[PDB]
Amino acid sequence: HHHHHHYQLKIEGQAPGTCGSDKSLLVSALANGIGLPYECASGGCGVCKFELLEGTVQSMWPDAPGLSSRDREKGNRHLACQCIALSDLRIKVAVQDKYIPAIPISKMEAEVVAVRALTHDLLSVKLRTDVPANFLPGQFCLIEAEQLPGVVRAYSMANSMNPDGFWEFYIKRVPTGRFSPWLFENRKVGARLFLTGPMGTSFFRPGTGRKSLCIGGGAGLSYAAAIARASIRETDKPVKLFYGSRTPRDAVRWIDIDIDEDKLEVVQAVTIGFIHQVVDAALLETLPEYEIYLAGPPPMVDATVRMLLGKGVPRDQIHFDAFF
Ligand code: FES
């Protein structure tokens, strides 16, 4: 389960690049500097849709919900984040500049170096690469475990850009979901994984002059924490942060995540109704004045953005990441 092939990737209107049997069309494109649209990079949001003009591809997730029942059954529309090339390809997609990697993405061999209890639910995993850890606050990595070849999943970085090559992620204590590269044989010090990134365009925006509100459900606390840290570093203003954990009062040691608890206004929502009703109650009609960042389970993120827009928050002050 080790050899891979390389093929030509022609994107109509762009320079002929390369693609392969070893990575998705998304990352090959992005790796080539092309702004192929994407958000989730994991088969759910539908944003990376392209039309297969010619050539043959293989899907990592045939049931991927980002592709509608219609599209899965009729025509030549596929998802770039889920598809590998099995020959030279010609595709058509609306390329945009805002998706060009801020920082050149790469395939990195990374070793687990530290694991520690974040919360009753969250486990923090710190890995090291031979290369500097270079990423913006709010970006993610796609993570693979050689045990499971076709099992790429997305995880927001929790720490910050450092020259020591450290990448931290928050993962679930209970192995739920379904398939994950975080087998328990891989949550031990010395395990080797593969990080692709940095990915994502929902990173922190400086110079807004607005206050930050970070909303993180479940493992989305990684993203929420990286934005909160970066806001405090920027302005020293108070950052309001809301998060969901199922057990009452499971505090996170904010000094271990390099965050000053002063300049930090934390409200936990114990996992009736949920997190976006706790935010709406607490802040009322003041939300439109904040720069808002969310992460979490797709249903939670979608409900919250609906609440936000319904409460008059400009679309361009809302930033999010939801992975499937
Ligand atoms: S980016 Fe491919 S479905 Fe979300």
Ligand SMILES: [Cl-]
């Ligand atoms: Cl990939």
Ligand SMILES: [Cl-]
């Ligand atoms: Cl697909």
Ligand SMILES: [Cl-]
């Ligand atoms: Cl790459």
Ligand SMILES: [Cl-]
């Ligand atoms: Cl997990």
Ligand SMILES: [Cl-]
């Ligand atoms: Cl949640």
Ligand SMILES: [Cl-]
């Ligand atoms: Cl989550």
Ligand SMILES: [Cl-]
């Ligand atoms: Cl930072």
Ligand code: NI
């Ligand atoms: Ni082969």
